From a paper:
To understand how the pyrimidine biosynthesis pathway accommodates the demand for dTTP, we began to focus on a key enzyme of the pathway, deoxyuridine triphosphate nucleotidohydrolase or dUTPase, which hydrolyzes dUTP to pyrophosphate and dUMP; dUMP is subsequently converted to dTTP. Concomitantly, a high dTTP to dUTP ratio is ensured, thus minimizing the incorporation of uracil during DNA synthesis. The curated genome of the soil amoeba D. discoideum shows a single gene (DictyBase Gene ID DDB_G0293374;) predicted to encode a dUTPase polypeptide containing the five hallmark motifs (M1–M5) of homotrimeric dUTPases, seen in the alignments of the amino acid sequences from mustard, yeast and human. While the dUTPases of Arabidopsis thaliana and D. discoideum have substantial stretches of identity (73%) within the 138-residue segment containing M1–M5, their N-termini have very low sequence similarity to each other, and to the human and yeast N-termini. Notably, within the lengthy N-terminus of the D. discoideum dUTPase, atypical of most dUTPases, computational analyses predict a mitochondrial targeting sequence (MTS).
The C-termini, which act normally as lids for the substrate binding pockets, instead were restricted in their movement, which may have allowed increased access of dUTP to the three active sites compared to the full-length protein with its extended N-termini.
Residue numbers in the entry:
A (entry chain A), B (entry chain C): 1 to 128
C (entry chain B): 1 to 130
Write the structure that this text describes.
Amino acid sequence: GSHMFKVKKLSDKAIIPQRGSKGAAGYDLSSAHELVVPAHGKALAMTDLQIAIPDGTYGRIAPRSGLAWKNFIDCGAGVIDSDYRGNVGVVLFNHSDVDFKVAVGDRVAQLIFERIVTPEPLEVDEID
Amino acid sequence: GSHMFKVKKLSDKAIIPQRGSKGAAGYDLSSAHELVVPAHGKALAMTDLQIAIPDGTYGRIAPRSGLAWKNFIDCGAGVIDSDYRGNVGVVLFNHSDVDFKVAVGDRVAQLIFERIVTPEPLEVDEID
Amino acid sequence: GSHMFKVKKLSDKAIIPQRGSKGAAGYDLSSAHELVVPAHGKALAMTDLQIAIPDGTYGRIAPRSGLAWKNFIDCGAGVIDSDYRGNVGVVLFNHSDVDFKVAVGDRVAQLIFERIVTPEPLEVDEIDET
Ligand SMILES: O=c1ccn([C@H]2C[C@H](O)[C@@H](COP(=O)(O)NP(=O)(O)OP(=O)(O)O)O2)c(=O)[nH]1
Ligand SMILES: O=c1ccn([C@H]2C[C@H](O)[C@@H](COP(=O)(O)NP(=O)(O)OP(=O)(O)O)O2)c(=O)[nH]1
Ligand SMILES: O=c1ccn([C@H]2C[C@H](O)[C@@H](COP(=O)(O)NP(=O)(O)OP(=O)(O)O)O2)c(=O)[nH]1
Ligand SMILES: [Mg+2]
Ligand SMILES: [Mg+2]
Ligand SMILES: [Mg+2]
Ligand SMILES: [Mg+2]
Ligand SMILES: [Mg+2]
């Protein structure tokens, strides 16, 4: 369906992503797992979700602004293809000298459905 | 708003964002404040702008390619929701060994109106 | 104008970007040059490609997921404008404690044609409440 996207929980801990405000760009993504993101290190926060990417778009794992500014947290990777398989994972980057604790249920990113196009590349001799 | 990019200066130091060329993806964002982005550190550069953005889009704070390559500067966070009516700020990351000076009026990022969709989430037991 | 993605090789070492799969978002970008991204450092991996992109888009240099989790590699900069006619360069960031080797032909990023809009900015006194 065009105006809804299906989401299936892979555990009881999974939270259905939802928009924070009427005008929100993204859907909050929460970790389904307790973990720590090491200082100057990286970690995988699995959401325990399968998500069906809308036609004409990819799912972008985008950073929460609070965590970025206060905790020096960022999202690496972040491209969820329309044919991505399985559990959707958030790759967290911590550039601070302080570990970042992640509890089950913590919002760790936001999912944005980026509209894109996918043409077939045409190799040429000259561009004008 | 509807299909517009509206810009309201919050101080006389604010500069209206403009595309560097007709083929540009992004609008130049300038700091309205002097600051330093510490080596291996982060800073918040406010634009002293309040904005309304076109429907079907969020504003993405993207990095300038020059600052990225010469100075190891990046943008953290960067997602400006269509219903944000606060002061638009650029979260700067400095991964280099050297402090990065930012003067009032310096271009520190570029704003891109990313087209997106926002379907409502539909929870299911199975996709496909 | 042009809904097409056109690609001109700038050397014999260049590889035409292609999607890894039918449902893939991005086009694999391969380095056309031997280099190393220094531990805790950055490097330019030129693709030796000149490109023309579809109208209403820019080209985003987006990170590969394997390199990100496995090697702590990220893409810096990454905005390829409609009028960029130079050699497309991948700015690679290495946040690991170990160097990252790049051989010619290595996929180092993926190109995504982001749909965007570019309206004329309007300075106003008043923005509507939210
Ligand atoms: O780089 C940024 C990112 C966000 N913002 C602004 C706009 C955006 O709409 C707003 C987000 O406000 P929130 O307090 O709701 N942060 P978020 O919902 O992303 O969660 P968190 O507070 O943990 O980041 O902050 C910036 O000015 N610059
Ligand atoms: O990762 C990138 C980013 C940009 N580019 C290209 C495309 C883009 O159109 C061009 C921008 O070159 P400049 O250094 O002149 N841009 P500047 O740093 O002056 O500002 P901005 O990056 O905001 O356009 O460089 C790449 O090849 N790879
Ligand atoms: O976002 C991520 C990134 C990595 N991972 C883990 C599991 C996954 O199997 C692996 C990344 O595999 P990819 O298929 O995404 N490799 P990549 O896209 O980088 O390269 P390519 O598709 O060309 O082989 O790392 C995640 O779960 N989520
Ligand atoms: Mg990034
Ligand atoms: Mg970016
Ligand atoms: Mg990948
Ligand atoms: Mg990018
Ligand atoms: Mg650019």
